[PDB]
Each structure stands twice: as structure tokens, then as C-alpha cells.
Scaffold this active site. Structure first.
Site, PDB file in Angstrom:
ATOM      1  N   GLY A  78      44.681 -29.585  61.302  1.00  0.00           N
ATOM      2  CA  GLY A  78      43.250 -29.139  61.404  1.00  0.00           C
ATOM      3  C   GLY A  78      42.710 -28.738  62.807  1.00  0.00           C
ATOM      4  O   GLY A  78      42.846 -27.552  63.420  1.00  0.00           O
ATOM      5  N   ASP A  79      42.587 -29.718  63.859  1.00  0.00           N
ATOM      6  CA  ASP A  79      42.060 -29.542  65.097  1.00  0.00           C
ATOM      7  C   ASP A  79      43.004 -29.857  66.357  1.00  0.00           C
ATOM      8  O   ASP A  79      42.826 -29.800  67.458  1.00  0.00           O
ATOM      9  CB  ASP A  79      41.091 -30.452  65.445  1.00  0.00           C
ATOM     10  CG  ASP A  79      39.711 -30.288  64.505  1.00  0.00           C
ATOM     11  OD1 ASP A  79      39.678 -29.174  63.902  1.00  0.00           O
ATOM     12  OD2 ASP A  79      38.755 -31.073  64.780  1.00  0.00           O
TER      13      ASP A  79
HETATM   14 CA    CA Z   1      42.501 -25.395  62.183  1.00  0.00          CA
HETATM   15 CA    CA Z   2      36.810 -29.492  63.391  1.00  0.00          CA
END
Ligand code: CA
Ligand code: CA
Lengths: 152, 152
Positions: free
Chosen positions: B18-19
Site C-alpha cells: 500500500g504505502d
Molecule cells: Ca499504493
Molecule cells: Ca495511505
DNA sequence: TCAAAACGTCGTACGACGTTTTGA
DNA sequence: TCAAAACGTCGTACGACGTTTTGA
């Protein structure tokens, strides 16, 4: 109500904490008794190149759908019931959005009750405010005080 | 050489997909024999108000550090030996950045012998090209081709 | 001469809303 | 009168690089 694999939850949780959104809204609408609708949404956002990943979610979770709007696609879960079953299970593993998750679970249970007293309806809207506050909110227009002004 | 909790890796894998960012660079630097440094960075980005998230990471991963960058913060892991041990255990859970994870720790193994032969060093630089190609690259300036010319 | 850090930038890829309509 | 979908934009919060310095 389906049970999800714990490892799938651990992963999905971190990923939701990462690219996900737990969202509640007071969408103005004249066809409702209180001129507003209470709307819940679980969404996972991803560049359309990787939308195969969201399609996977629809299969793993067995409810919801993906929608492409150009550069990005969203997984979308709005059906009140399966949403409860899902958040219920997923909530324990969240670390960044666990509070919004529970606020939603609470809102959902009060939903049938909230459509009776305009007071209890307004209380729930303050719950939505609490969710928007925990989020990185930037473009929010309708709040509980809107509902308050209109209820008069 | 710590061993990581599976529950911790599962969650993180999702959070990284994700991040997270697994980054590989060839940094132009006239103090290096081939005038370039092979740089590897594992990093997680987050709005500074949730800086405590990254901070907690540093405690649980055991190495790396966090740096504030105005409005967002980063957890960085660059130390070659820990990076290898860490990525070796997180690779099996990744879904969006597994390939680039495998390439990274494949580089870290060829590093010792890549500093002898330019043909072996230029080869490794094309592995760095593969990672850039898997990621959402947008501002990449130095590539194996650039290193190819400079090695003339 | 090298590992590692320090510090800097750019262009989205997300998050988090908003409206209006569907269809029981 | 509702739950749920359809469809829309805003403003970053990320990702993914870059250059230069440190110090064994
Ligand atoms: Ca992402
Ligand atoms: Ca985020």
C-alpha cells in the site's frame, strides 16, 4: 455470513490501512423523511493498471464490485449487512483505521433506530462527524450542524 | 539476524504493498570506481501526524530510522545486511512488490562481485532497471544505459 | 572508494468526499 | 421513503526517484 481466513485479514488489514478508506456521509436528499441519507462505504483505491488486485478482493470477500474511473479503480462495499459481517471480522487487525471501523459498526446497528426520533438521528450524525475527523478529511460540506439547521 | 512474527509480516506486507516502496538506484558519484553507487532503499511513507506508526516500526523491525520531511515522514532501511534479512522474510507475503523484492535481494548478493568486473556491474545495473520498470517510475534519470556510456 | 546518510523534487495514486438517479 | 448504485472532483499523502555529504 461468511467467515474469512485470518491470514487474509491480517494482510488485507495492513493494505486497507494503506490504500483503503472507511467513509460515512450525510448525503442531502429530499426523498428522505429527514431530507438526508446516511451512507456507509468501504473502499480500496488502486491505479487501474493493477485493478486485477481489486477484482481479486471481490472474489475473496464474495461481495462488492470494482469500478474504473480512468486512472484509478475502487473496490466498493456499501451493502449494509455484508459490510457489518466484514468490518466485524477485519476490525481487530486494523491499526490506523480501527476507530472509524467501529464507529461504522455502531452507526449501522443504530440505523433502524435512528430513522424514528429526529433526535437519535442527529446523534448518529455526530458519529459520522467523528469518522470524518479521524480521516484526512478535506472536501467535506454536509455535517451534523447542517442536519440540525434543516430539522428546524 | 532477528526472526519476525508471521502476524507482523502478514500485516506489514499488506501495508507495504500500500504505502511502501522498494527502490533501486544508480547514483552518479565521481568517488566510485565506476563513478556510480548502487543504492537500495526500503521505505514507508506517511503523513507526519501518524509519524508514531513509522516510529513504532523502527522498534519492531529493529533497524532503520524515521525522518521528518515537512508534511510527511519516512521510515528508511538502507543497511545492506539487515535489508536482506528483512526482505527475505517479507517477500513470501508481498503481492504487489514481490518481484522487486526478489530482485533487490538478488542484487545484494551480486554486489561483492559486481565491484570487480564492469560487465558484472553493468549487468547488475539492468536488474536495477527491472525494479524501476516494475514500480511506478516517473522521474528516473540514471539507468544502466547511462552507466554503459560512462564506462567508455 | 565505499556504505550509509543527509537532504531535495516531482507527478501522481490515492483517500475522501460531493451529487443525482435507481429501483424495491 | 428507503438502500444501493452511478458517476463526479478535490487536494493531497504518497511513492519514487534525484543530488550531495559523511566518515572507516
Ligand atoms: Ca499504493
Ligand atoms: Ca495511505
Amino acid at each position: 455470513n461468511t467467515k474469512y481466513n485470518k491470514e487474509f485479514l491480517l494482510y488485507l488489514a495492513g493494505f486497507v490501512d494503506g490504500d483503503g478508506s472507511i467513509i460515512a456521509q450525510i448525503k442531502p436528499n429530499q426523498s428522505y423523511k429527514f431530507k438526508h441519507q446516511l451512507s456507509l462505504t468501504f473502499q480500496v483505491t488502486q491505479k487501474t493498471q493493477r485493478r486485477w488486485f481489486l477484482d481479486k478482493l471481490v472474489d475473496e470477500i464474495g461481495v462488492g464490485y470494482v469500478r474504473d474511473r480512468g486512472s484509478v479503480s475502487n473496490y466498493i462495499l456499501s451493502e449494509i449487512k455484508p459490510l457489518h459481517n466484514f468490518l466485524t471480522q477485519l476490525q481487530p487487525f486494523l491499526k490506523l483505521k480501527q476507530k472509524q471501523a467501529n464507529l461504522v459498526l455502531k452507526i449501522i446497528e443504530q440505523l433502524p433506530s435512528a430513522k424514528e426520533s429526529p433526535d437519535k438521528f442527529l446523534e448518529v450524525c455526530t458519529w459520522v462527524d467523528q469518522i470524518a475527523a479521524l480521516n484526512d478529511s478535506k472536501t467535506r460540506k454536509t455535517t451534523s450542524e447542517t442536519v440540525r439547521a434543516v430539522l428546524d
